[PDB]
């Protein structure tokens, strides 16, 4: 008659398939830790009913809007159910790459030069001031929706005349899009668990960038944990990530993506407040290097909830 835990997984975002896999692993991991957990997919079950269904606490293993963007957190707060990860504001902010970037820049943290566009602006036609700002970024650029994950809607632009094609793709996924200076890399990601910063991971895609195929389907993506940074470079990275996490107001756990550029400086890409939790995901990889099994990790994430 101890706590009944709902593992929310699946949902209706572009990251549904990834989330099914995250939730599958989290479910088994929690049960291995002695937690009485059950899978609940919001696509199939009305989550407004969780309290009436007898659940006491919620492990969020959803990715994307509908699960990660503060909407669900809002509902759970009013239902009075404790839940894992960041609260309403920090979840909403971390989902919005445009506003994450603004906040980080306001805080004096390093971000890639960028231009933001609304769908209305793109349809009105780009102004001469806009084409100028875009041209100043140089080529290549990367184009992303503001509010996606798993590299959904993203592409690399290598010729001026194909910027429009990259924008049309990103606008299939959001009403606000970012065009960012291309960063040389290498690429890193840093997981956070409570007040601990976990070992950084260096990510080496076999193709152009860390796209959906490289993240979930390829056996050619290479990871390094530890990341191979000199001790002080690692300390610098961890300090940057902590300041970026605290600036957004995040809590519980998450994962922040960072790249070096040609100037030798680290640049923040985004924060993820409900990161991948498949067996082969990066938060589990960093936690493993820090001495935690997958089950110990999910138990710890749940313990951190409200």
């Amino acid at each position: 008659m101890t706590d009944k835990i709902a593992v929310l997984l699946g949902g209706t975002s572009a990251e549904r398939e990834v989330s099914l896999n995250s939730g599958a692993a989290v479910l088994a991991g929690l049960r291995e830790g002695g937690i009485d957990a059950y899978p609940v997919d919001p696509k199939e079950v009305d989550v407004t009913q969780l309290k009436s269904m007898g659940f006491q606490k919620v492990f969020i293993a959803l990715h994307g809007r509908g699960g990660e963007d503060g909407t669900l957190q809002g509902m759970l707060e009013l239902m009075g159910l404790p839940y894992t990860g960041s609260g309403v504001m920090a979840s909403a902010l971390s989902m919005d790459k445009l506003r994450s970037k603004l906040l980080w820049q306001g805080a004096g943290l390093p971000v890639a030069p960028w231009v933001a566009l609304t769908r209305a602006e793109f349809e009105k036609g780009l102004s001469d001031k806009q084409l100028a700002e875009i041209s100043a970024l140089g080529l290549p650029v990367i184009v992303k929706p503001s509010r996606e994950g798993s590299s959904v809607g993203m592409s690399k632009v290598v010729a001026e005349n194909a910027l429009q094609d990259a924008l049309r793709l990103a606008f299939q996924h959001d009403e606000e899009v970012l065009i960012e200076k291309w960063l040389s890399g290498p690429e890193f990601t840093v997981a956070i668990l409570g007040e601990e910063i976990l070992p950084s991971i260096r990510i080496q895609p076999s193709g152009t960038f860390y796209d959906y195929e490289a993240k979930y389907l390829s056996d050619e993506t290479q990871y390094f944990c530890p990341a191979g940074l000199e001790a002080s470079q690692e300390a610098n990275l961890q300090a940057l990530v902590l300041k970026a996490w605290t600036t957004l107001g995040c809590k519980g756990w998450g994962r922040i993506d960072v790249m070096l550029d040609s100037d030798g400086q680290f640049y923040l890409l985004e924060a993820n407040t409900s990161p991948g939790m498949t067996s082969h995901s990066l938060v589990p990889m960093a936690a493993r290097q820090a001495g935690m099994s997958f089950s110990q990790l999910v138990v710890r994430i749940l313990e951190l909830a409200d």
Binding site: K4, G34, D36
Partner: peptide, 8 residues
């Protein structure tokens, strides 16, 4: 309810 961990 029938639970994964019976009792508790």
């Amino acid at each position: 309810e029938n639970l994964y961990f019976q009792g508790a």
